[PDB]
Amino acid sequence: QIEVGPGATNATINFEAGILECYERFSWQRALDYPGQDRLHRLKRKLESRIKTHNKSEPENKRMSLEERKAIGVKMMKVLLFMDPSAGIEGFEP
Amino acid sequence: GNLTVKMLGGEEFLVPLRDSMLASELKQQIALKTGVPAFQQRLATHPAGTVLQDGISLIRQGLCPGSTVLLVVKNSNDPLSILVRNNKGRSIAYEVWLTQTVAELKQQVCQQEHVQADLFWLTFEGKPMEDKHQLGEYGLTPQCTVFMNLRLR
């Protein structure tokens, strides 16, 4: 278990919007099986409730819909998969 | 003059900037301030994403007060088998990962050679290994041989 700071709640939400976007793109390829499609829909719905909660706790100008967070998540994923900051520079902002 | 270090997710913190500071020495400051070991750090500039050269001054690489550096953490954690040879020419096999410390390795040897960890020190390729450092900082390869050296006291 790794010690993390206060920004992790936000970062994790964004990362997992990236994860959800990956599942969604994978499902279009007809390669995500039926229990996996089920985890996709469960992830989406728990994500949407955490984004409603987290957006209430944040200033109005720092609130972001699922779609905006998905792009942030995708940028972070690109940086992790290549381990290269160049693949997604905006992933380094909250 | 301060340097701003930014991690994936948005967490940022400040590191005082010295002109002639080497990028390797930046990693040691981040290590000290965050506990991310230097050999696990990958540093790059913002917004280009160009990697820092470890043996060149930061001012020589376009960094000045207010500049941002991006930190990405790389973790080996790939177990490998090494040998540790005692002062009688006998070698025991140990499994380690490059992200383990020298202190963890001495704990293993301690239990197999029945010598207190304070009565010996380890060396790889003649260079003595320091407890707090991680094994990757000495470049251990599979089936290499670390040597056990006995202290008088």
Task: List domains and CATH numbers for chain A.
Answer: 1-94 (1.10.287.10)
Residues of A in contact with B36 (CB under 8 A): none
d(CA A51, CA A53): 5
Can you name the residues that pair with B96 across neighbouring β-strands? Answer: B80
Residues of B in contact with A10 (CB under 8 A): 9-10
Q: Does A74 touch chain B (CB under 8 A)?
A: no
- How many CB atoms sit inside 10 A of residue A51's CB? 20
Phi and psi dihedrals of B95, rounded to 5?
A: -100, 130
Q: State the number of CA atoms in the 13 A half-sphere of A85 facing the CB.
A: 28
Q: Does A82 touch chain B (CB under 8 A)?
A: no
Answer yes or no: are the C-beta atoms of B64 and B89 closer than 8 Å: no
Q: Is the peptide bond before A6 cis (omega within 30 degrees of 0)?
A: no
Experimental method: X-ray
CA distances to B50, B70, B77, B132, B146 from A83, rounded to whole Å, are 13, 12, 15, 26, 31
Sign of CA dihedral B70, B76, B77, B83: negative
Contact yes or no for A92 and B49 at CB 8 A: no
The 8-class DSSP code of residue A68 comes to H
Answer yes or no: are the C-beta atoms of A17 and A47 closer than 8 Å: yes
Residue reference for tokens 């940086």:
A79
Q: DSSP 3-state helix, strand, coil percentages of chain B (rounded to 5)?
A: 25, 35, 40
Strands B80-85 and B145-150 come out as parallel
Q: Buried b / exposed e across A3-40, counting CB within 10 Å, b at 16+?
A: eeeeeeebbebbbbbbbbbebeeeeeeeebeeeeeeeb
Closest in A15, A84, A89 to B47, CB measured: A89
Strands B120-124 and B127-128 come out as antiparallel
Strands B145-150 and B120-124 come out as antiparallel
Residues of A in contact with B9 (CB under 8 A): 7-8, 10-12, 14-15, 76, 91-92, 94
Residues of A in contact with B67 (CB under 8 A): none
Residues of B in contact with A14 (CB under 8 A): 9
How far away is chain B from the Cα of A55, in angstroms, using its nearest Cα?
A: 16
Which among A12, A15, A92, A93 is the top mutation candidate for probing chain B, defined by the most B β-carbons within 10 Å of its own β-carbon?
A92
d(CA B98, CA B140): 7
d(CA A51, CA A56): 8
Output the six-digit token pair for B124. Answer: 């790889």
Give me the resolution in angstroms, 1 decimal.
Answer: 2.4
Output the six-digit token pair for B1. Answer: 């003059």
Residues of A in contact with B70 (CB under 8 A): 85, 89, 92
Q: For residue B137, which amino acid is it?
A: E
The answer for residues whose C-beta is within 8 angstroms of residue A54's C-beta and 6 or more apart is: A9, A10, A13
Q: Does A89 touch chain B (CB under 8 A)?
A: yes
Long-range CB contacts for residues A1-8, cutoff 8 Å, separation at least 24: A5/B11, A7/A94, A7/B9, A7/B10, A7/B11, A8/B9, A8/B11
A74: enclosing H helix or E strand? helix A66-82
Closest in A7, A83, A85 to B10, CB measured: A7
